[PDB]
PDB file of C-alpha atoms and ligand atoms in Angstrom:
ATOM      1  CA  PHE Y   3     115.659  85.517 103.899  1.00  0.00           C
ATOM      2  CA  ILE Y   4     116.813  86.741 107.411  1.00  0.00           C
ATOM      3  CA  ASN Y   5     120.227  88.526 107.552  1.00  0.00           C
ATOM      4  CA  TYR Y   6     121.007  87.910 111.308  1.00  0.00           C
ATOM      5  CA  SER Y   7     123.504  90.809 112.069  1.00  0.00           C
ATOM      6  CA  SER Y   8     121.463  93.373 110.038  1.00  0.00           C
ATOM      7  CA  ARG Y   9     118.191  92.137 111.784  1.00  0.00           C
ATOM      8  CA  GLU Y  10     116.018  92.684 108.592  1.00  0.00           C
ATOM      9  CA  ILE Y  11     114.435  89.689 106.678  1.00  0.00           C
ATOM     10  CA  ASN Y  12     114.214  90.057 102.844  1.00  0.00           C
ATOM     11  CA  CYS Y  13     111.338  88.870 100.566  1.00  0.00           C
ATOM     12  CA  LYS Y  14     111.291  88.325  96.763  1.00  0.00           C
ATOM     13  CA  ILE Y  15     108.588  89.927  94.561  1.00  0.00           C
ATOM     14  CA  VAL Y  16     108.957  89.512  90.761  1.00  0.00           C
ATOM     15  CA  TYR Y  17     106.898  90.958  87.872  1.00  0.00           C
ATOM     16  CA  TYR Y  18     106.277  88.527  84.973  1.00  0.00           C
ATOM     17  CA  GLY Y  19     104.585  89.196  81.613  1.00  0.00           C
ATOM     18  CA  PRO Y  20     105.151  89.396  77.805  1.00  0.00           C
ATOM     19  CA  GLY Y  21     107.498  91.675  75.814  1.00  0.00           C
ATOM     20  CA  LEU Y  22     106.167  95.245  76.378  1.00  0.00           C
ATOM     21  CA  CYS Y  23     103.279  94.749  78.889  1.00  0.00           C
ATOM     22  CA  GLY Y  24     103.854  97.077  81.895  1.00  0.00           C
ATOM     23  CA  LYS Y  25     106.558  95.659  84.234  1.00  0.00           C
ATOM     24  CA  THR Y  26     108.949  98.700  83.819  1.00  0.00           C
ATOM     25  CA  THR Y  27     106.130 101.304  84.068  1.00  0.00           C
ATOM     26  CA  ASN Y  28     104.972  99.441  87.249  1.00  0.00           C
ATOM     27  CA  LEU Y  29     108.301  99.829  89.156  1.00  0.00           C
ATOM     28  CA  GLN Y  30     108.670 103.438  87.963  1.00  0.00           C
ATOM     29  CA  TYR Y  31     105.206 104.493  89.355  1.00  0.00           C
ATOM     30  CA  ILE Y  32     106.343 102.924  92.694  1.00  0.00           C
ATOM     31  CA  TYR Y  33     110.050 104.106  93.125  1.00  0.00           C
ATOM     32  CA  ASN Y  34     109.574 107.363  91.008  1.00  0.00           C
ATOM     33  CA  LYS Y  35     106.618 108.268  93.333  1.00  0.00           C
ATOM     34  CA  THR Y  36     107.703 107.383  96.956  1.00  0.00           C
ATOM     35  CA  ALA Y  37     110.361 108.876  99.431  1.00  0.00           C
ATOM     36  CA  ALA Y  38     114.175 108.362  99.733  1.00  0.00           C
ATOM     37  CA  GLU Y  39     114.357 107.463 103.516  1.00  0.00           C
ATOM     38  CA  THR Y  40     112.667 104.036 102.815  1.00  0.00           C
ATOM     39  CA  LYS Y  41     113.805 103.060  99.251  1.00  0.00           C
ATOM     40  CA  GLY Y  42     117.278 102.466  97.755  1.00  0.00           C
ATOM     41  CA  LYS Y  43     118.219 103.171  94.114  1.00  0.00           C
ATOM     42  CA  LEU Y  44     116.743 101.870  90.769  1.00  0.00           C
ATOM     43  CA  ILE Y  45     119.309  99.554  89.165  1.00  0.00           C
ATOM     44  CA  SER Y  46     119.098  98.947  85.411  1.00  0.00           C
ATOM     45  CA  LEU Y  47     121.480  96.300  84.025  1.00  0.00           C
ATOM     46  CA  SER Y  48     121.838  95.438  80.311  1.00  0.00           C
ATOM     47  CA  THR Y  49     123.865  93.375  77.820  1.00  0.00           C
ATOM     48  CA  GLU Y  50     123.386  92.688  74.016  1.00  0.00           C
ATOM     49  CA  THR Y  51     121.357  89.542  74.929  1.00  0.00           C
ATOM     50  CA  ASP Y  52     119.302  90.300  78.155  1.00  0.00           C
ATOM     51  CA  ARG Y  53     118.125  93.134  80.523  1.00  0.00           C
ATOM     52  CA  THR Y  54     117.354  93.358  84.310  1.00  0.00           C
ATOM     53  CA  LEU Y  55     115.629  96.129  86.380  1.00  0.00           C
ATOM     54  CA  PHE Y  56     115.364  95.988  90.240  1.00  0.00           C
ATOM     55  CA  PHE Y  57     115.046  98.011  93.493  1.00  0.00           C
ATOM     56  CA  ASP Y  58     114.863  97.604  97.401  1.00  0.00           C
ATOM     57  CA  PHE Y  59     112.688  99.465  99.985  1.00  0.00           C
ATOM     58  CA  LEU Y  60     111.289  99.451 103.556  1.00  0.00           C
ATOM     59  CA  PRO Y  61     107.456  99.110 103.864  1.00  0.00           C
ATOM     60  CA  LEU Y  62     105.092 101.556 105.621  1.00  0.00           C
ATOM     61  CA  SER Y  63     102.809  99.105 107.601  1.00  0.00           C
ATOM     62  CA  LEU Y  64     105.033  96.523 109.490  1.00  0.00           C
ATOM     63  CA  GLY Y  65     107.718  96.498 112.234  1.00  0.00           C
ATOM     64  CA  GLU Y  66     108.230  93.224 114.215  1.00  0.00           C
ATOM     65  CA  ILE Y  67     107.847  89.522 113.097  1.00  0.00           C
ATOM     66  CA  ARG Y  68     110.477  87.999 115.494  1.00  0.00           C
ATOM     67  CA  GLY Y  69     111.233  91.607 116.506  1.00  0.00           C
ATOM     68  CA  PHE Y  70     112.188  92.547 112.896  1.00  0.00           C
ATOM     69  CA  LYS Y  71     110.609  94.149 109.761  1.00  0.00           C
ATOM     70  CA  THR Y  72     110.735  92.898 106.092  1.00  0.00           C
ATOM     71  CA  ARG Y  73     112.518  94.565 103.092  1.00  0.00           C
ATOM     72  CA  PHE Y  74     110.876  93.523  99.808  1.00  0.00           C
ATOM     73  CA  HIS Y  75     112.611  93.536  96.407  1.00  0.00           C
ATOM     74  CA  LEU Y  76     111.056  93.901  92.937  1.00  0.00           C
ATOM     75  CA  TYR Y  77     112.903  92.097  90.101  1.00  0.00           C
ATOM     76  CA  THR Y  78     111.939  92.334  86.382  1.00  0.00           C
ATOM     77  CA  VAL Y  79     113.034  92.055  82.648  1.00  0.00           C
ATOM     78  CA  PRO Y  80     112.215  95.082  80.359  1.00  0.00           C
ATOM     79  CA  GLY Y  81     111.622  94.579  76.600  1.00  0.00           C
ATOM     80  CA  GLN Y  82     111.577  91.348  74.560  1.00  0.00           C
ATOM     81  CA  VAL Y  83     114.103  89.187  76.490  1.00  0.00           C
ATOM     82  CA  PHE Y  84     114.851  86.268  74.135  1.00  0.00           C
ATOM     83  CA  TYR Y  85     116.918  83.845  76.329  1.00  0.00           C
ATOM     84  CA  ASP Y  86     115.041  81.758  78.954  1.00  0.00           C
ATOM     85  CA  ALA Y  87     118.185  81.224  81.153  1.00  0.00           C
ATOM     86  CA  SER Y  88     117.812  84.871  82.417  1.00  0.00           C
ATOM     87  CA  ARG Y  89     114.061  84.555  83.259  1.00  0.00           C
ATOM     88  CA  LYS Y  90     114.888  81.263  85.090  1.00  0.00           C
ATOM     89  CA  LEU Y  91     117.673  83.286  86.887  1.00  0.00           C
ATOM     90  CA  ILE Y  92     115.075  86.017  87.876  1.00  0.00           C
ATOM     91  CA  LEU Y  93     113.013  83.351  89.763  1.00  0.00           C
ATOM     92  CA  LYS Y  94     115.998  82.348  92.004  1.00  0.00           C
ATOM     93  CA  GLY Y  95     114.150  81.671  95.288  1.00  0.00           C
ATOM     94  CA  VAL Y  96     111.024  83.763  94.519  1.00  0.00           C
ATOM     95  CA  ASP Y  97     108.518  84.502  97.340  1.00  0.00           C
ATOM     96  CA  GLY Y  98     105.744  86.366  95.467  1.00  0.00           C
ATOM     97  CA  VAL Y  99     104.962  86.823  91.741  1.00  0.00           C
ATOM     98  CA  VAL Y 100     102.793  89.344  89.862  1.00  0.00           C
ATOM     99  CA  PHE Y 101     101.603  88.604  86.302  1.00  0.00           C
ATOM    100  CA  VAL Y 102     101.213  91.799  84.234  1.00  0.00           C
ATOM    101  CA  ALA Y 103      99.041  90.527  81.389  1.00  0.00           C
ATOM    102  CA  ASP Y 104      98.568  92.884  78.375  1.00  0.00           C
ATOM    103  CA  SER Y 105      94.814  93.416  77.695  1.00  0.00           C
ATOM    104  CA  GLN Y 106      95.817  94.183  74.045  1.00  0.00           C
ATOM    105  CA  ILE Y 107      93.885  91.911  71.622  1.00  0.00           C
ATOM    106  CA  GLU Y 108      97.032  91.928  69.412  1.00  0.00           C
ATOM    107  CA  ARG Y 109      99.189  90.421  72.193  1.00  0.00           C
ATOM    108  CA  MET Y 110      96.509  88.348  73.963  1.00  0.00           C
ATOM    109  CA  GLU Y 111      97.914  85.118  72.550  1.00  0.00           C
ATOM    110  CA  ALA Y 112     101.235  86.499  73.990  1.00  0.00           C
ATOM    111  CA  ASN Y 113     100.024  86.407  77.611  1.00  0.00           C
ATOM    112  CA  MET Y 114      99.113  82.683  77.409  1.00  0.00           C
ATOM    113  CA  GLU Y 115     102.578  81.538  76.147  1.00  0.00           C
ATOM    114  CA  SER Y 116     104.313  83.878  78.697  1.00  0.00           C
ATOM    115  CA  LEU Y 117     102.146  82.370  81.534  1.00  0.00           C
ATOM    116  CA  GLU Y 118     103.040  78.846  80.230  1.00  0.00           C
ATOM    117  CA  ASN Y 119     106.739  79.848  80.714  1.00  0.00           C
ATOM    118  CA  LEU Y 120     106.095  80.890  84.377  1.00  0.00           C
ATOM    119  CA  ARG Y 121     104.137  77.567  84.745  1.00  0.00           C
ATOM    120  CA  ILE Y 122     107.162  75.563  83.347  1.00  0.00           C
ATOM    121  CA  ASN Y 123     110.178  77.492  84.872  1.00  0.00           C
ATOM    122  CA  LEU Y 124     108.890  77.365  88.516  1.00  0.00           C
ATOM    123  CA  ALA Y 125     107.962  73.623  88.740  1.00  0.00           C
ATOM    124  CA  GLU Y 126     111.495  72.998  87.283  1.00  0.00           C
ATOM    125  CA  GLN Y 127     112.960  75.035  90.228  1.00  0.00           C
ATOM    126  CA  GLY Y 128     110.690  73.247  92.791  1.00  0.00           C
ATOM    127  CA  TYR Y 129     107.849  75.810  92.959  1.00  0.00           C
ATOM    128  CA  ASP Y 130     104.080  75.073  92.557  1.00  0.00           C
ATOM    129  CA  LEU Y 131     102.178  78.247  91.431  1.00  0.00           C
ATOM    130  CA  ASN Y 132      98.957  77.260  93.276  1.00  0.00           C
ATOM    131  CA  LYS Y 133     100.749  77.646  96.686  1.00  0.00           C
ATOM    132  CA  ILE Y 134     103.636  80.117  95.963  1.00  0.00           C
ATOM    133  CA  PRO Y 135     102.098  83.669  96.002  1.00  0.00           C
ATOM    134  CA  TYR Y 136     100.847  84.571  92.543  1.00  0.00           C
ATOM    135  CA  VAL Y 137      98.558  87.525  91.569  1.00  0.00           C
ATOM    136  CA  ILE Y 138      97.536  88.727  88.014  1.00  0.00           C
ATOM    137  CA  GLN Y 139      97.382  92.428  86.948  1.00  0.00           C
ATOM    138  CA  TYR Y 140      95.262  93.147  83.806  1.00  0.00           C
ATOM    139  CA  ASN Y 141      97.109  96.214  82.408  1.00  0.00           C
ATOM    140  CA  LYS Y 142      96.723  98.514  79.307  1.00  0.00           C
ATOM    141  CA  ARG Y 143      92.950  98.948  80.082  1.00  0.00           C
ATOM    142  CA  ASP Y 144      92.899 102.537  78.591  1.00  0.00           C
ATOM    143  CA  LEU Y 145      93.592 101.275  75.010  1.00  0.00           C
ATOM    144  CA  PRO Y 146      90.322 100.964  73.004  1.00  0.00           C
ATOM    145  CA  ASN Y 147      91.576  97.736  71.320  1.00  0.00           C
ATOM    146  CA  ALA Y 148      91.658  95.962  74.770  1.00  0.00           C
ATOM    147  CA  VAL Y 149      89.434  92.874  75.406  1.00  0.00           C
ATOM    148  CA  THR Y 150      86.831  92.591  78.248  1.00  0.00           C
ATOM    149  CA  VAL Y 151      88.240  91.315  81.616  1.00  0.00           C
ATOM    150  CA  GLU Y 152      85.421  88.649  81.721  1.00  0.00           C
ATOM    151  CA  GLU Y 153      87.359  86.900  78.878  1.00  0.00           C
ATOM    152  CA  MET Y 154      90.814  87.341  80.514  1.00  0.00           C
ATOM    153  CA  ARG Y 155      89.567  85.699  83.787  1.00  0.00           C
ATOM    154  CA  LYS Y 156      88.310  82.729  81.652  1.00  0.00           C
ATOM    155  CA  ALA Y 157      91.495  82.298  79.516  1.00  0.00           C
ATOM    156  CA  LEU Y 158      94.375  83.484  81.791  1.00  0.00           C
ATOM    157  CA  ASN Y 159      92.949  83.105  85.341  1.00  0.00           C
ATOM    158  CA  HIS Y 160      91.527  79.558  84.713  1.00  0.00           C
ATOM    159  CA  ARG Y 161      92.277  78.416  88.357  1.00  0.00           C
ATOM    160  CA  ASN Y 162      91.828  81.833  90.178  1.00  0.00           C
ATOM    161  CA  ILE Y 163      93.871  83.298  92.244  1.00  0.00           C
ATOM    162  CA  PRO Y 164      93.274  87.087  92.882  1.00  0.00           C
ATOM    163  CA  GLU Y 165      93.115  89.569  89.948  1.00  0.00           C
ATOM    164  CA  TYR Y 166      93.582  93.403  89.635  1.00  0.00           C
ATOM    165  CA  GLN Y 167      92.450  95.777  86.816  1.00  0.00           C
ATOM    166  CA  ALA Y 168      95.189  98.455  86.331  1.00  0.00           C
ATOM    167  CA  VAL Y 169      96.642 101.269  84.088  1.00  0.00           C
ATOM    168  CA  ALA Y 170     100.420 101.800  84.650  1.00  0.00           C
ATOM    169  CA  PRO Y 171     101.101 105.484  83.463  1.00  0.00           C
ATOM    170  CA  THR Y 172      98.131 106.802  85.596  1.00  0.00           C
ATOM    171  CA  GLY Y 173      99.115 104.557  88.544  1.00  0.00           C
ATOM    172  CA  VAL Y 174      95.655 102.845  88.765  1.00  0.00           C
ATOM    173  CA  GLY Y 175      96.156  99.697  90.896  1.00  0.00           C
ATOM    174  CA  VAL Y 176     100.012  99.663  90.612  1.00  0.00           C
ATOM    175  CA  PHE Y 177     100.452  99.901  94.434  1.00  0.00           C
ATOM    176  CA  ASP Y 178      97.010  98.097  94.933  1.00  0.00           C
ATOM    177  CA  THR Y 179      98.455  95.029  93.170  1.00  0.00           C
ATOM    178  CA  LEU Y 180     101.658  95.098  95.331  1.00  0.00           C
ATOM    179  CA  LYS Y 181      99.693  95.385  98.666  1.00  0.00           C
ATOM    180  CA  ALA Y 182      97.883  92.088  97.823  1.00  0.00           C
ATOM    181  CA  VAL Y 183     100.982  89.949  97.124  1.00  0.00           C
ATOM    182  CA  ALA Y 184     102.807  91.535 100.150  1.00  0.00           C
ATOM    183  CA  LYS Y 185     100.229  90.271 102.742  1.00  0.00           C
ATOM    184  CA  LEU Y 186      99.993  86.926 100.850  1.00  0.00           C
ATOM    185  CA  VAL Y 187     103.810  86.477 101.345  1.00  0.00           C
ATOM    186  CA  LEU Y 188     103.675  87.913 104.936  1.00  0.00           C
ATOM    187  CA  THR Y 189     101.055  85.259 105.893  1.00  0.00           C
ATOM    188  CA  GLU Y 190     103.310  82.534 104.351  1.00  0.00           C
ATOM    189  CA  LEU Y 191     106.216  83.634 106.672  1.00  0.00           C
ATOM    190  CA  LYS Y 192     105.256  82.223 110.173  1.00  0.00           C
TER     191      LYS Y 192
HETATM  192  N1  LIG G 201      98.533 103.289  77.599  1.00  0.00           N
HETATM  193  C1  LIG G 201      99.262 102.473  78.362  1.00  0.00           C
HETATM  194  N2  LIG G 201     100.539 102.257  78.058  1.00  0.00           N
HETATM  195  C2  LIG G 201     101.140 101.400  78.910  1.00  0.00           C
HETATM  196  C3  LIG G 201     100.598 100.771  80.011  1.00  0.00           C
HETATM  197  N3  LIG G 201     101.535  99.949  80.611  1.00  0.00           N
HETATM  198  C4  LIG G 201     102.603 100.088  79.867  1.00  0.00           C
HETATM  199  N4  LIG G 201     102.428 100.950  78.817  1.00  0.00           N
HETATM  200  C5  LIG G 201     103.383 101.296  77.761  1.00  0.00           C
HETATM  201  O1  LIG G 201     103.801 100.107  77.125  1.00  0.00           O
HETATM  202  C6  LIG G 201     105.167 100.257  76.679  1.00  0.00           C
HETATM  203  C7  LIG G 201     106.002  99.090  77.157  1.00  0.00           C
HETATM  204  O2  LIG G 201     105.829  98.871  78.574  1.00  0.00           O
HETATM  205  P1  LIG G 201     107.080  98.831  79.574  1.00  0.00           P
HETATM  206  O3  LIG G 201     106.523  98.660  80.983  1.00  0.00           O
HETATM  207  O4  LIG G 201     107.900 100.063  79.503  1.00  0.00           O
HETATM  208  O5  LIG G 201     107.991  97.568  79.228  1.00  0.00           O
HETATM  209  P2  LIG G 201     108.003  96.046  79.702  1.00  0.00           P
HETATM  210  O6  LIG G 201     108.931  95.978  80.908  1.00  0.00           O
HETATM  211  O7  LIG G 201     108.678  95.246  78.589  1.00  0.00           O
HETATM  212  O8  LIG G 201     106.618  95.566  80.004  1.00  0.00           O
HETATM  213  C8  LIG G 201     105.615 101.653  77.115  1.00  0.00           C
HETATM  214  O9  LIG G 201     105.491 102.582  76.042  1.00  0.00           O
HETATM  215  C9  LIG G 201     104.651 101.980  78.256  1.00  0.00           C
HETATM  216  O10 LIG G 201     104.434 103.375  78.419  1.00  0.00           O
HETATM  217  C10 LIG G 201      99.227 101.018  80.327  1.00  0.00           C
HETATM  218  O11 LIG G 201      98.591 100.565  81.277  1.00  0.00           O
HETATM  219  N5  LIG G 201      98.633 101.890  79.432  1.00  0.00           N
END
């Protein structure tokens, strides 16, 4: 999304996953551990029905595509967002998507049905997941109730697609996940 006069194209990175998985902790480790003269301000919106969390920033690797740099955005939905007309609204012209799956055995049947939603909301909006940048981040690895990744690749990453093992409050692969989707969108931009 080029802005002509402002001479700075904008991309769309979204974090998808079940209710309480690691989308909010992901953006915090990023914004809460960066520098002001690059990023904007962390916006948190909320109503009695739905919630939205998002921020904007300038990368630290690029400069000129047509003589201009990109300015990625990270959009998400904290908590158990009931209504599906807000999660359809969060994918309004998405460029790259990250799937924060919860390694928790308790909510392992929760990742499947949440992935099914991403696989049914995008094709509805004219987006095929196999071409539109999509990465998966296996979070909550520290918890001793968590399943082996060998099983998560079999059940959630059926038609792989790059994967990343991460732990959100320690920062493990929070930024390492983002750097993968970034280049995947940057390549699909010329
Ligand atoms: N131990 C641990 N806790 C995590 C991890 N990721 C998220 N959490 C916790 O899980 C809870 C819900 O996650 P949060 O990101 O805040 O909300 P979400 O936006 O609905 O996924 C919070 O208490 C987080 O601290 C992780 O990798 N390890």
